[PDB]
Design a protein around this ligand. Sequence first.
Ligand SMILES: *[C@@H]1O[C@H](CO)[C@@H](O[C@@H]2O[C@H](CO)[C@@H](O[C@@H]3O[C@H](CO[C@H]4O[C@H](CO[C@H]5O[C@H](CO)[C@@H](O)[C@H](O)[C@@H]5O[C@H]5O[C@H](CO)[C@@H](O)[C@H](O)[C@@H]5O)[C@@H](O)[C@H](O[C@H]5O[C@H](CO)[C@@H](O)[C@H](O)[C@@H]5O[C@H]5O[C@H](CO)[C@@H](O)[C@H](O)[C@@H]5O)[C@@H]4O)[C@@H](O)[C@H](O[C@H]4O[C@H](CO)[C@@H](O)[C@H](O)[C@@H]4O[C@H]4O[C@H](CO)[C@@H](O)[C@H](O)[C@@H]4O)[C@@H]3O)[C@H](O)[C@H]2NC(C)=O)[C@H](O)[C@H]1NC(C)=O
Ligand SMILES: *[C@@H]1O[C@H](CO)[C@@H](O[C@@H]2O[C@H](CO)[C@@H](O[C@@H]3O[C@H](CO[C@H]4O[C@H](CO)[C@@H](O)[C@H](O)[C@@H]4O)[C@@H](O)[C@H](O[C@H]4O[C@H](CO)[C@@H](O)[C@H](O)[C@@H]4O[C@H]4O[C@H](CO)[C@@H](O)[C@H](O)[C@@H]4O[C@H]4O[C@H](CO)[C@@H](O)[C@H](O)[C@@H]4O)[C@@H]3O)[C@H](O)[C@H]2NC(C)=O)[C@H](O)[C@H]1NC(C)=O
Ligand SMILES: *[C@@H]1O[C@H](CO)[C@@H](O[C@@H]2O[C@H](CO)[C@@H](O[C@@H]3O[C@H](CO[C@H]4O[C@H](CO[C@H]5O[C@H](CO)[C@@H](O)[C@H](O)[C@@H]5O[C@H]5O[C@H](CO)[C@@H](O)[C@H](O)[C@@H]5O)[C@@H](O)[C@H](O)[C@@H]4O)[C@@H](O)[C@H](O[C@H]4O[C@H](CO)[C@@H](O)[C@H](O)[C@@H]4O)[C@@H]3O)[C@H](O)[C@H]2NC(C)=O)[C@H](O)[C@H]1NC(C)=O
Ligand SMILES: *[C@@H]1O[C@H](CO)[C@@H](O[C@@H]2O[C@H](CO)[C@@H](O[C@@H]3O[C@H](CO[C@H]4O[C@H](CO)[C@@H](O)[C@H](O)[C@@H]4O)[C@@H](O)[C@H](O[C@H]4O[C@H](CO)[C@@H](O)[C@H](O)[C@@H]4O)[C@@H]3O)[C@H](O)[C@H]2NC(C)=O)[C@H](O)[C@H]1NC(C)=O
Ligand SMILES: *[C@@H]1O[C@H](CO)[C@@H](O)[C@H](O)[C@H]1NC(C)=O
Ligand SMILES: *[C@@H]1O[C@H](CO)[C@@H](O)[C@H](O)[C@H]1NC(C)=O
Ligand SMILES: OC[C@H]1CNC[C@@H](O)[C@@H]1O
Ligand code: NA
Ligand code: NA
Lengths: 832, 833
Amino acid sequence: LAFSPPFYPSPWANGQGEWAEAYQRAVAIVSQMTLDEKVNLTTGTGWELEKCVGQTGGVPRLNIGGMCLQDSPLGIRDSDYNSAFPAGVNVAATWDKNLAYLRGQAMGQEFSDKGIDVQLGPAAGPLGRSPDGGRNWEGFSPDPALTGVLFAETIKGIQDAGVVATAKHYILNEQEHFRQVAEAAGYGFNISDTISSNVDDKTIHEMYLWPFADAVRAGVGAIMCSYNQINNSYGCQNSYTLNKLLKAELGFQGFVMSDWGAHHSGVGSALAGLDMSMPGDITFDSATSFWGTNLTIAVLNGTVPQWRVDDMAVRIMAAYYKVGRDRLYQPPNFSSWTRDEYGFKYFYPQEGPYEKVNHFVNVQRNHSEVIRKLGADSTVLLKNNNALPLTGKERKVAILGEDAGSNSYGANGCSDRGCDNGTLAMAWGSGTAEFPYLVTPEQAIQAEVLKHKGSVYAITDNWALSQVETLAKQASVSLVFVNSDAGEGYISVDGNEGDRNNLTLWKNGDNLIKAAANNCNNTIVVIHSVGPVLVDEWYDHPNVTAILWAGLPGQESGNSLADVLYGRVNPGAKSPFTWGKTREAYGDYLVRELNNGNGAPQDDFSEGVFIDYRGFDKRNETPIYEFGHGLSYTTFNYSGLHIQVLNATETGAAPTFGQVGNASDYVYPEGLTRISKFIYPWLNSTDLKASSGDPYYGVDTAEHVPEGATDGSPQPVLPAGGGSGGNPRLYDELIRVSVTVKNTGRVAGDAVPQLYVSLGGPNEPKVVLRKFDRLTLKPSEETVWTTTLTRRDLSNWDVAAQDWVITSYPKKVHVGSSSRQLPLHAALPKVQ
Amino acid sequence: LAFSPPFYPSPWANGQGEWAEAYQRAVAIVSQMTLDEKVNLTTGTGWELEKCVGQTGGVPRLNIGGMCLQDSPLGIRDSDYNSAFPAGVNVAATWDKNLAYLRGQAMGQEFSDKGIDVQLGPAAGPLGRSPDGGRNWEGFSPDPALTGVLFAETIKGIQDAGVVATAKHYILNEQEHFRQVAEAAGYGFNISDTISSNVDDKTIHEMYLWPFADAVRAGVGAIMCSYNQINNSYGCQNSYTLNKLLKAELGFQGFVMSDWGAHHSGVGSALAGLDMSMPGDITFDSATSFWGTNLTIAVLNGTVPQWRVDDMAVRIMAAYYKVGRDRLYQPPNFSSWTRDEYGFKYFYPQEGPYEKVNHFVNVQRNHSEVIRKLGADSTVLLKNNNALPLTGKERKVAILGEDAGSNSYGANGCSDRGCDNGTLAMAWGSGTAEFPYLVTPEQAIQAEVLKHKGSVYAITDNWALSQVETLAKQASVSLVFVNSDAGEGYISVDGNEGDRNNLTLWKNGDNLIKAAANNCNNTIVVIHSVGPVLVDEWYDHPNVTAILWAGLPGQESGNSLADVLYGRVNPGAKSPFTWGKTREAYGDYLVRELNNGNGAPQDDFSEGVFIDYRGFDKRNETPIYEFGHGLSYTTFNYSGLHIQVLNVATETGAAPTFGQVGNASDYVYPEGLTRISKFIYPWLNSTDLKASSGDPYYGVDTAEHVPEGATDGSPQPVLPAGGGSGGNPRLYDELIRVSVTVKNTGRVAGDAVPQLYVSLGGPNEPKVVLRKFDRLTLKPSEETVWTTTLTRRDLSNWDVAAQDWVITSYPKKVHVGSSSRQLPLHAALPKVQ
Ligand SMILES: *[C@@H]1O[C@H](CO)[C@@H](O[C@@H]2O[C@H](CO)[C@@H](O[C@@H]3O[C@H](CO[C@H]4O[C@H](CO[C@H]5O[C@H](CO)[C@@H](O)[C@H](O)[C@@H]5O[C@H]5O[C@H](CO)[C@@H](O)[C@H](O)[C@@H]5O)[C@@H](O)[C@H](O[C@H]5O[C@H](CO)[C@@H](O)[C@H](O)[C@@H]5O[C@H]5O[C@H](CO)[C@@H](O)[C@H](O)[C@@H]5O)[C@@H]4O)[C@@H](O)[C@H](O[C@H]4O[C@H](CO)[C@@H](O)[C@H](O)[C@@H]4O[C@H]4O[C@H](CO)[C@@H](O)[C@H](O)[C@@H]4O)[C@@H]3O)[C@H](O)[C@H]2NC(C)=O)[C@H](O)[C@H]1NC(C)=O
Ligand SMILES: *[C@@H]1O[C@H](CO)[C@@H](O[C@@H]2O[C@H](CO)[C@@H](O[C@@H]3O[C@H](CO[C@H]4O[C@H](CO)[C@@H](O)[C@H](O)[C@@H]4O)[C@@H](O)[C@H](O[C@H]4O[C@H](CO)[C@@H](O)[C@H](O)[C@@H]4O[C@H]4O[C@H](CO)[C@@H](O)[C@H](O)[C@@H]4O[C@H]4O[C@H](CO)[C@@H](O)[C@H](O)[C@@H]4O)[C@@H]3O)[C@H](O)[C@H]2NC(C)=O)[C@H](O)[C@H]1NC(C)=O
Ligand SMILES: *[C@@H]1O[C@H](CO)[C@@H](O[C@@H]2O[C@H](CO)[C@@H](O[C@@H]3O[C@H](CO[C@H]4O[C@H](CO[C@H]5O[C@H](CO)[C@@H](O)[C@H](O)[C@@H]5O[C@H]5O[C@H](CO)[C@@H](O)[C@H](O)[C@@H]5O)[C@@H](O)[C@H](O)[C@@H]4O)[C@@H](O)[C@H](O[C@H]4O[C@H](CO)[C@@H](O)[C@H](O)[C@@H]4O)[C@@H]3O)[C@H](O)[C@H]2NC(C)=O)[C@H](O)[C@H]1NC(C)=O
Ligand SMILES: *[C@@H]1O[C@H](CO)[C@@H](O[C@@H]2O[C@H](CO)[C@@H](O[C@@H]3O[C@H](CO[C@H]4O[C@H](CO)[C@@H](O)[C@H](O)[C@@H]4O)[C@@H](O)[C@H](O[C@H]4O[C@H](CO)[C@@H](O)[C@H](O)[C@@H]4O)[C@@H]3O)[C@H](O)[C@H]2NC(C)=O)[C@H](O)[C@H]1NC(C)=O
Ligand SMILES: *[C@@H]1O[C@H](CO)[C@@H](O)[C@H](O)[C@H]1NC(C)=O
Ligand SMILES: *[C@@H]1O[C@H](CO)[C@@H](O)[C@H](O)[C@H]1NC(C)=O
Ligand SMILES: OC[C@H]1CNC[C@@H](O)[C@@H]1O
Ligand code: NA
Ligand code: NA
């Protein structure tokens, strides 16, 4: 079986780069803390014991309120009077750094105004190994350069608005199936440990880790480690991914929290680089924790060095100070577990004062504007045979498909969005927010038609084909809506356990489109979906005159779409993944059956880097719509490529901050009423063994602590580390590339120039994206797009050097409008 | 068994009153026609043979195009790019003569622009004997005064727009069960003839006949006789209702058409006062007709007098001229049977030239505006505990109920509206039109809330009660939508064979309302229905803060309602029927089982005049909401009632004939004409009359089957109650002027609906009966004096001994106020005669 080698000690923070001020403030306050106070920062207080999806107890003697951590990557979960933004995959479809940022900012503002300290998002893991993976839509794209840039801009927007962002899930959680042992049991499978993603060192560096290096360099304050194992070592105690890759090589200065139920040991995880346990207990409301009491004991008994807990507390306070949360602090003014105005303060056991638990604060501001805009700018026009934009003069409009209409249970009528009923504007699981309302395509397109005194109807039963056919024969234009949904693995909809069982349109979508197109010579298909779907049965039908993919647009869905269909917005989005002829064309199959008996299922990433377009190009397969493809209401020309060549070895010793006293300093204080299931830092008595309750307490302890796990002496800086996101020399700019871009059509709009490189060598993809931008040009207007290639951009990861190297194979650059339409190309000059 | 006494001969037209010019022009043209041409005017061409629901062949030699007759009373049926107006019941709820006229005008304009000559509406029969009758909603109100006045204004709007209106159904078609034998057989019932409505002479004059007297006096061109029998004689050959009540007593000058399949004999119907057979065949596509060829033969063989057939022709041409149809004529520019651009000219057999059958003419103009306004102005506010109007500042709005949302088959996705899915804006059967679009309450209310930056959702599955209760707990206001549907008897939805099986909300509505009100202290109920529904289980719930009934609003439903809920329109509508505690409180049970073996079921109207509020008041029962009840966002005061007393041929001419009849050979099929399969023609196969009729009863006991008087063309007496239009003109003398001051005593402009009831006196008269009303717009503090007059008819009762209206010697009283039960002003009336 795959093996995960050790890397110890867990590196300590050092005030790196833009962290210097936040780290000095964190060390000044952590220095004042007792051991039980430090431990309070590191451990949640128990599932649904307070207000937020995750919440720590804070340090009240030092005026630090408990840290409130809340989903989701696309808006506040489990709350009220908040907005529901389009999903991360829509941000990927915009290819628009500025919109990713502005969406970050608007979410940060709403979370901050609910008294939330830490947003659990954005996501870049899953990256998207498999097109049917259940959570790819929360992240961005299976391409690392596109994902890493939009991930980083999202982070910066959220943190500039004063909320800590949490880059998740770290790392290789590329499928829902078998990701948790209790979930698998509920779905009929008996496994002893979760699925192990088994991945070679070059692949992890070139693909899955690269957006985390961007998040790190962009200043992300938190990282959430993942439920799966990596080479048979759990993500939240994997010393290789956490100590070596994240903290030593990428130089991460913030804190690593567990995913909920992903914490699997106290001592093991603390020494392997975990800093925060969520929701704080061992299983939900077990009243036991691998940390809390147990971590205070682990330090008192000498097994976890003081410097390790001290560094947890410094990383946690430093992220909180880095975003300025201290200046915006207020306790969470809502409850994730009830919408009632009043309730017992501690929800799960219904204890504590009976008091106001919701204040109904309306944090929406004018955020519907950025959502409606980001929806229109993420609507990919895949096909347009001169059918769009509409004019408003069409005499009779047929709106067809359940995906155009209302969810009959209300927009929030399925818990965590766990159904696919009515228009699909948000997929399911934790990656969700309550809509404040939901504008359906039916509502916005019928309003638009009635404004022009046209005739219009909506048929929203996809087996009502008699009516579809009759109305399609009478219509000037048939707008046909179809979807495909997916989500987090703890929910199953129609037997899809988070992951999609296939890429075919749900709810009779293919037959609905063929019924319309058999009868209307102007059939326009609109797809809402978590990722690609199969279109081969109808996309080339002669009466299908346009096709659009609008992703998961959030609350302004129908208005975002109408703006595009009626020409208020000229679509600029590009596909952020590949649209293949068959599921086989993508390869990268999910592990859907036990393959290691009743042990952990083994998920070998045997394709290496060759996911999505890199795999189609390697196999010489032709996509229907390639990565980077999207049309516009105008045309663009690219010409005039020009290329120009441009002109610490050790750490400190681990520090300790403050003093640790005797056990009797950490016994429960006598005036305090202990709330049932609440997780505390304190001991029942000075008897360490008895207060831990651990059946393994004090047995074979040293043989269970890896060599070096307690070494606080100065360490070597890795060749590829020493900076933020990697050695700073990786970010030196080596080549500048320019091209001229002209709008040669009649409509103002945006181009998305894309710069790919070919790094050369027998095992490298033919082309890999490295730069892009989204440039607004009026008709006939031109501009020069200039960008630069860094040392990292031209490197490959060398497993023998443990470093990025520019290999000696000759490299080329290609610029154009998609991964398959690259009219400009040149050999690059040799650089090192 | 009830018996229907004979009345012969069938009165001939005479140019009465406003018909003088139309009659002269009809005589002049019918004088030029051959017998087969005349017959062509009287008989439709066969079910689906041409474009319109009914269609005659016309007279091409004299450039008279075939007459195109199309449904419905609320908009053009079976067509395209037309509007869908609110139902006649909503017009009744407006209590607004002007809006009634404006709706008729906007409908006549649309019909005229499609090349339709005759609109099959409006309807005042069923009047509304039973609250569960399947078609009451197409008419107006169970009250004859409210109905007759709004029926009349609807007819004047249509005919002023140049289309002939058809007052239907004449008469006593008060229920759908057993109305047609083949329908009854499709539902498992074996009957040899249709339901017989059996009614006494005073009741028919005081109730069912009264709105038709108004129709006739307002100048209606056509009348459509009914499927039921009346005292065991079919509506379309009932000499008593057609010859005596309609043509002699009411003096009707236009033409009587059959309902479709209501024509039951050639000779018998022509002599009993029928003028036009629709759709022209005996059963759909039978290629046989009681008229056409048979009527030509019946005149040739001496059995139907030429004067009778000339009179049919003159009544038909006179109605056509009277509305100026000849000045707007164009062939129908759509087909009722297909939406294809091209097709065979003769749809049913797919014969004739292949040519353009649809021109897709957009006739809607800006009629959405009158629809929008009339839906708002017909929304009755039944209860409002200071909950409405909404301000727009409600922080979270729950829209609850399938009736708020879309029909998932599309607004037109159920044929003839034969389902109750999504918002109910139109009930089912022939009384329907294709929506151009349908704005749902969900759409218009969610749009209003988003304009104010509120939060809003719609739950539209009425068994999703977990979600309903969760959202209702979170909401500032919960708007709960519920409905109850019905329609014409040939369609059954959920076992309701046209008629409603109960007056309970459909689709779990009572449980939905209780789920919302148990959780939300500001639950507002909105009812779309064909008539009253039982509200006893929740109307008085402490968290039910407002209740509205919005009827069947047509295509602008959601916008009409939002205009009211948000106070752009202050509701002025008033209930046009009673809301009782139980079904038993209304009495008047439908006949739902065979009670005459396998012969015609018998429907005895044994309550006499005591239907709807007259029955409740007679039984001393308290309605939840009485007839005439509606609240406003302002208040009104009525004061200062004052009463002021104010200051005909005896024989007809002889029956004329116009033009000449020749030999049987003039009427044989023309040699060079292709005869279209199933098409009905006026021509004979040969000069053999017997063989050309194909009638198994031809020449059988003929004399015995021709009623006494039926061929009598000599001068007739004028009935004491006849001699004018809608009755002897002395009935319309104004005898009393009544005035009262109405003041808006509140803070917002609005419409008051003053109502004037009389008590006629006498042991068997209703305690009060509506006579006058108007709808008056007043600004805050403004006053106005409402003045109206009572006519001799208004103060009379029908005396069966005299056969005339008589002001009886019991002391009479006037009562004025805001409903049938809120009448603060009363005055004794002085003796007048
Ligand atoms: C010139 O050319 C013309 C065009 O071709 C020729 O016209 C044909 O003339 C024939 C006579 O020669 C006609 O045939 C006879 O028709 C009658 C009338 O039938 C209709 O009306 C019935 C009710 O009638 C009353 O009311 C009408 C007006 O509404 C009056 O006109 C009648 O006079 C009669 O009036 C009395 O009652 C009213 C009150 O109700 C009073 O106010 C009056 O004061 C009078 O008292 C109605 O019931 C009939 O309905 C039947 O038919 C419908 C289908 O059309 C169907 O939907 C109904 O369910 C019902 O079906 C049942 O009956 C029919 C037959 O009629 C069966 O086939 C069927 O299967 C069912 O049983 C209809 O709407 C009709 O009554 C005559 O039939 C009676 O007499 C014959 C024998 O003479 C019997 O064989 C029949 O069974 C029947 O017997 C019943 O009645 C008897 C009373 O008379 C009684 O003794 C018996 O006990 C029995 O119960 C004839 O069928 C033919 O209609 C007409 N064709 C056209 C196309 O117009 C003309 O002949 C020719 N001239 C010359 C000189 O050659
Ligand atoms: C790890 O994080 C966890 C989670 O955040 C931290 O746990 C929290 O620690 C808090 C202390 O920082 C502790 O706070 C206590 O709350 C109690 C309940 O308060 C609520 O109910 C009261 C009473 O109705 C309301 O007044 C109040 O507003 C709340 O609604 C308080 O009662 C405690 O107040 C006492 O201590 C504080 C100072 O901490 C005094 O300011 C206050 O006056 C009270 O002082 C009395 O009691 C203390 C000790 O209990 C005495 O030392 C003092 O002399 C006073 O004694 C008199 O009164 C008591 C009875 O009232 C009487 O017996 C005595 O004889 C005298 O007459 C305090 O505010 C949270 O409950 C606790 N959270 C949970 C879930 O357990 C933990 O500290 C963190 N750990 C570290 C190491 O940082
Ligand atoms: C007066 O005249 C009116 C008009 O004719 C008469 O009304 C009819 O009354 C009938 C008798 O009540 C009604 O028939 C009943 O219909 C009930 C509801 O059927 C619908 O809803 C259910 C439940 O839907 C939920 O669950 C679905 C499947 O899980 C889900 O898809 C759906 O979205 C709903 O979800 C919510 O709830 C679930 C859990 O419950 C949650 O998980 C979810 O999150 C949501 O919260 C659905 O199954 C069904 O297919 C349909 O769409 C039925 O439930 C009744 O059937 C039960 O009881 C029967 C005994 O009565 C028994 O045979 C049967 O086996 C069931 O146990 C029943 O069919 C009818 O609809 C009314 N028609 C109209 C037009 O209103 C009225 O009866 C007359 N009144 C009187 C006094 O005479
Ligand atoms: C009772 O009402 C019915 C239905 O309205 C009338 O029946 C129609 O009568 C009209 C007028 O006579 C008939 O019209 C004839 O149609 C023929 C076919 O016309 C179409 O197809 C041709 C061939 O492709 C086209 O070229 C043409 O434009 C039409 O689109 C015409 O060809 C006839 O006109 C000429 O033909 C005859 C040949 O016999 C010659 O005498 C002349 O040269 C003449 O120019 C004619 O127009 C129509 O077909 C009838 N309809 C049906 C359904 O049968 C009755 O006439 C009316 N009865 C009374 C007594 O008024
Ligand atoms: C600590 O004491 C508490 C309360 O007495 C007891 O419930 C708990 O089990 C003890 N913990 C351990 C590890 O024994
Ligand atoms: C008249 O002639 C047609 C065509 O020959 C024949 O089919 C039809 O049956 C006849 N009508 C009658 C009453 O015989
Ligand atoms: O559709 C034509 C006729 C059918 N029977 C009912 C009438 O109201 C209608 O106009
Ligand atoms: Na086809
Ligand atoms: Na309650």
